[PDB]
């Protein structure tokens, strides 16, 4: 019943008793494990709310207290008569941080405590969303000294279109599928770059053309919005020793802000709640620039290092990959922008597992996503067994609005 | 769509459904509540259903399901379990099971060679001295002067009441782990327990980083005898870098033949407590885990220093850079010495081919993602992008408790 988690580098041992608090099922069954899969293939609400309200009041050391009880009646009352209810600013703030804390695939949770929350639940239009979104960016970016933040737009409502941000991230480079089927720019954004054009956007022809934001207000065709060039900070990549690297003209935005995930708190669902902290070097240097289905610049950088790309055993792949990540870490450091390498990042996650072991008796984590895409076993997390389960508040994936 | 797990390859965008899992009879460690996929070691009536299941697998394997021989064999097996409690496997039934167990091994990335396994039957073996001969024979054949060949030696099965045949060492070839006065460990920390055991048993311990441990062989109802391997049979490879001349001066070395020897081979209900197998190494096994693990040889920081890297800050990727060189060294050194080895890129590419083949053959392939993706350059290999379903199919290889 209670998993025995072992760290094979130290010999440590713990017992995750927190997974017992999981109220929702995962993809695995005793017959088979599907943990490596990326996507998952009134009384009810009242329970998720009653449970969440409790979590909130225990959080501020006041369970049972008058306030706690009177707040439970308010929720009972609202749900019973309208089928739904709403959250108080502070409860929203507690829920947002909890959702981050429970994010099994996030390696930056050591920071879960410092999260600037913006209540944008009084939004009426895409125009208004664009403003809120622009302020989130100015704040988050804070002149290169990034600060983690989230902006929560109106929750979803029965028989009413969800507020949505069609973009995957508030900042993404366009992907133009050219004549020969190949792609110009970011191949992961081919589809979204098209929808923008379909809605009247003057496409560029560059490899890093910052896409416009397609914001959608309830039951209404989305609206195109261009982001003020200065709000979007970008770092030009160069190598600390390879003078020719800079030539490649590689660059990347500084603000990783997810905008297509749904935030569920006490039964409520927020379909537009973009959040951002800061990048882990490998996200940019290993996955965005080296995935075969992304910019795939591995071979380029290799012929540039005069590497024997003739065969796999010469490890030209691993060699080129390490330089690219080193270039990212250098550039950001130079540009004076927050970034965290996978070594510093995972040692901090180990700390996190510790703090959480004491504080809640466990920490849900997706091993396949916590271990960096490169140098895996060279980081402490690789040798750490982990348990993965769904806790609420939580960030979830949701269908594309088209 | 189909009511079987849906599998996607995020690189090529291709989809497939695994229907082979419906075949699994042994439950795993996960439940809808929590996934324990990252855990390394998660904790007659029936002997017949298992044997029956295997015989069927055998006969279909040769395309004679329902035939006379098949139905007659099923009778034979029941008749034997009915009057003795157990039963024996025919020569060819064993070769089939041994290969099927490999083919079903979720953590092996080298499955593409599964059909190319040399099965040495040794179920006649009766003495520990005899176990030593077989093993020595196995190492001779498998090493084959560097041109390694997959092989497995099957010793007598667990008999009711009677003691199991067992090999105490985790591998037929391992380096001694000497616990020091000052607390450290000279050699391979992994094998400290087995060295303290070889000594409690009469071995005269050496004092190096690469002392080849002696074999502790255990015949039914007897303390293990201590046998030391003839240096001639244990092929080793001195490691040296192709452009870092000083690397060769570290005195780092590794053996050619990787031979798991403490794993249980389960075929049709029967259990073979001693059935050592071997293939050949994937460069990262040596160059990243054995030599760079914090709890193994731990040579990362040393080699890092020799490269003039800044070991002061993690942000220099000094670990990343050194690991890459240590691996290029294992590959270079193995190639030079004309010893068989495969790198993680080549290895994983063939596993992709294996999955594709297995798709058409059985409708799926059980794989442990965390174990298939290499300890380094993970997303640079195609497996990283392949979703995988993991489950237990029999025949199989299972971890088994230490005999002590
Ligand atoms: C402050 C520094 C932060 C860092 C370094 C960080 C790093 C990461 C990394 C590397 C991943 C995996 C990304 C990928 O491979 O696609 C991740 C996933 C995630 N992070 Fe964080 N994170 C941070 C802050 C945040 C914040 C502010 C939130 C929420 C309030 C958050 C929520 C999540 C979620 C929900 C996921 C999983 C997304 C998915 O399933 O695709 N992270 N984070
Ligand atoms: C032919 C070349 C082969 C290659 C390159 C190969 C490679 C691998 C690798 C890289 C591992 C994981 C090592 C580790 O992380 O400790 C592994 C695990 C495994 N292999 Fe293979 N293998 C081969 C042959 C064999 C043979 C001949 C068998 C059995 C007949 C086999 C059975 C297994 C099993 C049971 C595991 C999992 C063992 C465990 O849980 O520790 N492999 N193999
Ligand atoms: C198929 C496999 O689950 C997939 O490629 C996962 C592996 N680990 C990952 N880890 C992180 N951080 N991010 C990812 O997108 C992935 N992709
Ligand atoms: C804790 C975690 O399960 C452990 O470090 C696993 C991860 N993947 C692995 N993969 C292989 N091939 N071999 C291993 O020993 C491991 N160790
Ligand atoms: N570093 C962060 N990374 C998350 C963004 C990357 C992707 N949008 C995650 N979802 C898609 C991956 N299949 N987040 N952050 O807040 O810092
Ligand atoms: N490549 C092979 N590797 C076997 C190594 C497996 C180790 N005995 C077990 N891992 C250590 C503890 N989890 N085998 N082979 O036959 O090629
Ligand atoms: C720029 As090219 C080497
Ligand atoms: C061996 As030192 C440089
Ligand atoms: Zn699982």
Closest by CA to A279, choosing from A253, A251, A314, A308, is A253
R_g of chain A computed on alpha carbons? 22
Q: Do B288 and A373 touch (CB under 8 A)?
A: no
Distance CA B283, CA B286 (A): 6
Q: What is the DSSP letter of B286?
A: I
Write out the residue limits of the CATH 3.90.340.10 domain(s) in chain A.
16-121+148-158+262-276+346-370
The long-range contacts involving A57-66, CB below 8 angstroms and separated by at least 24 positions, are A59/A94
- B40 touches ligand 6 (CB under 6 Å): yes
CATH homologous superfamily of A122-147+162-233+397-401 equals Nitric Oxide Synthase;Heme Domain;Chain A domain 2 (3.90.440.10)
Q: Is A201 a catalytic residue?
A: no
Burial of B10 (0-12, 13-18, 19+ CB in 10 A): middle
Question: Is there a contact between A33 and B390 (Cβ–Cβ < 8 Å)?
Answer: yes
Distance CA A43, CA A79 (A): 9
Distance CA B36, CA A285 (A): 30
Distance CA A79, CA B13 (A): 43
Residues lining ion ligand 9 (Cβ < 5 A) are: A 28, 33, 35; B 30, 35, 37
Does the CB of B378 have a partner CB in chain A at under 8 Å?
Answer: yes
Ligand nearest to the CA of B348: 2
Distance CA A215, CA A200 (A): 14
Write out the residue limits of the CATH 3.90.440.10 domain(s) in chain B.
124-149+164-235+399-403
Distance CA A89, CA A85 (A): 13
Any idea which fold B236-258+281-346 has?
3.90.1230
Instruction: Give me the residues paired with residue A149 across strands.
Output: A116, A276
Distance CA B71, CA B348 (A): 41
Q: Do B388 and A36 touch (CB under 8 A)?
A: yes
Q: Is the dihedral of CA A134, A139, A141, A147 positive or negative?
A: negative
Q: Do A385 and B38 touch (CB under 8 A)?
A: yes
Q: Do B375 and A373 touch (CB under 8 A)?
A: no
Question: Is there a contact between A246 and A236 (Cβ–Cβ < 8 Å)?
Answer: yes
How was this model experimentally determined?
Answer: X-ray
Distance CA A4, CA A17 (A): 10
Distance CA B128, CA B224 (A): 8
C-alpha distance from B332 to closest chain A C-alpha (Å): 8
Assigned architecture for domain B124-149+164-235+399-403? Alpha-Beta Complex (3.90)
∠ Cα B229 B230 B232 (to 5°): 130
Assigned architecture for domain A234-256+279-344? Alpha-Beta Complex (3.90)
Tokens representing residue B356 in the block:
């594709």
Ligand 8 atom 2: residue of nearest CA: B306
Three-state DSSP class for A102? Answer: helix
Three-state DSSP class for A280? Answer: strand
Q: How far is CA B171 from CA A295, B135, B176, in A?
A: 43, 11, 12
Q: Where are the alpha helices (DSSP H) in A36-65?
A: 43-59
Write out the residue limits of the CATH 3.90.1230.10 domain(s) in chain B.
236-258+281-346
Assigned architecture for domain B18-123+150-160+264-278+348-372? Alpha-Beta Complex (3.90)
Q: How far is CA A58 from CA A46, A52, A73, A99, in A?
A: 18, 10, 17, 16
Q: What is the DSSP letter of B282?
A: B
Distance CA B336, CA B263 (A): 32
Tokens representing residue B250 in the block:
């570290």
Question: Is there a contact between B403 and B163 (Cβ–Cβ < 8 Å)?
Answer: no
For the domain made up of A16-121+148-158+262-276+346-370, the CATH class stated in words is alpha beta
Three-state DSSP class for B165? Answer: coil
Tokens representing residue B82 in the block:
């009915």
Distance CA B107, CA B97 (A): 18
Longest CA span, chain B:
73
Contacts of B237 (CB under 8 A, 6+ apart): B253, B254, B255, B256, B333, B334, B337, B339
Tokens representing residue B279 in the block:
């293939």
Cis peptide before B28 (omega within 30 of 0): no
Q: Where are the alpha helices (DSSP H) in A213-366?
A: 281-282, 298-304, 316-335, 342-360
Q: Is A109 a catalytic residue?
A: yes
Distance CA A261, CA B273 (A): 50
| Lookup result for tokens 């005195």 | B251
Write out the residue limits of the CATH 3.90.1230.10 domain(s) in chain A.
234-256+279-344
Longest CA span, chain A:
73
Tokens representing residue B389 in the block:
């379903």
> Which of A288, A338, A377 should we substitute to test contact with B (largest number of B Cβ atoms within 10 Å)?
A377
């Amino acid at each position: 019943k209670f998993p025995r988690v072992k760290n094979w580098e130290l010999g440590s041992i713990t017992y995750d008793t927190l997974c017992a608090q999981s109220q929702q099922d995962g993809p695995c069954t005793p017959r088979r494990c599907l943990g490596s899969l990326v996507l998952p293939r009134a009384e009810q609400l009242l329970s998720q709310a009653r449970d969440f309200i409790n979590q909130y009041y225990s959080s501020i050391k006041r369970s049972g207290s008058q306030a706690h009880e009177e707040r439970l009646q308010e929720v009972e009352a609202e749900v019973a008569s309208t089928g739904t209810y709403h959250l108080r600013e502070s409860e929203l703030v507690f829920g947002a941080k909890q959702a981050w804390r429970n994010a099994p695939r996030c390696v930056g949770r050591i920071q879960w405590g410092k999260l600037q929350v913006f209540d944008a639940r009084d939004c009426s239009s895409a125009q208004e969303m664009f403003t809120y979104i622009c302020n989130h960016i100015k704040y988050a970016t804070n002149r290169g000294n990034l600060r983690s933040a989230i902006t929560v737009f109106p929750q979803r409502a029965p028989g009413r279109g969800d507020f949505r941000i069609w973009n995957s991230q508030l900042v993404r480079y366009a992907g133009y599928r050219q004549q020969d089927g190949s792609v110009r720019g970011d191949p992961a954004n081919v589809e979204i770059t098209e929808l923008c054009i379909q809605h009247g956007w003057t496409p560029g022809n560059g490899r890093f053309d910052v896409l416009p934001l397609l914001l959608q207000a309830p039951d209404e065709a989305p609206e195109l919005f261009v982001l003020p060039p200065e709000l979007v900070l970008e770092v030009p990549l160069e190598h600390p020793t390879l003078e020719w690297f800079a030539a490649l003209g590689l660059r990347w935005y500084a603000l990783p802000a997810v905008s297509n995930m749904l935030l569920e708190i006490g039964g409520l669902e927020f379909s537009a709640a973009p959040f951002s902290g800061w990048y882990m070097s490998t996200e940019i240097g290993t996955r965005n620039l080296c995935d075969p289905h992304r910019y795939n610049i591995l071979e380029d950088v290799a012929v540039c290092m005069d590497l024997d790309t003739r065969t796999t055993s010469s490890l030209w792949k691993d060699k080129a990959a390490v330089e690219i990540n080193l270039a990212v870490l250098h550039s950001f450091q130079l540009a004076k922008v927050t970034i965290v390498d996978h070594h510093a990042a995972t040692v901090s996650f180990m700390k996190h597992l510790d703090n959480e072991q004491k504080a809640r008796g466990g920490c849900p984590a997706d091993w396949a996503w916590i271990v960096p895409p490169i140098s895996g076993s060279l980081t402490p997390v690789f040798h750490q067994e982990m348990v993965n389960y769904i806790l609420s508040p939580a960030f979830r994936y949701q269908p594309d609005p088209w």
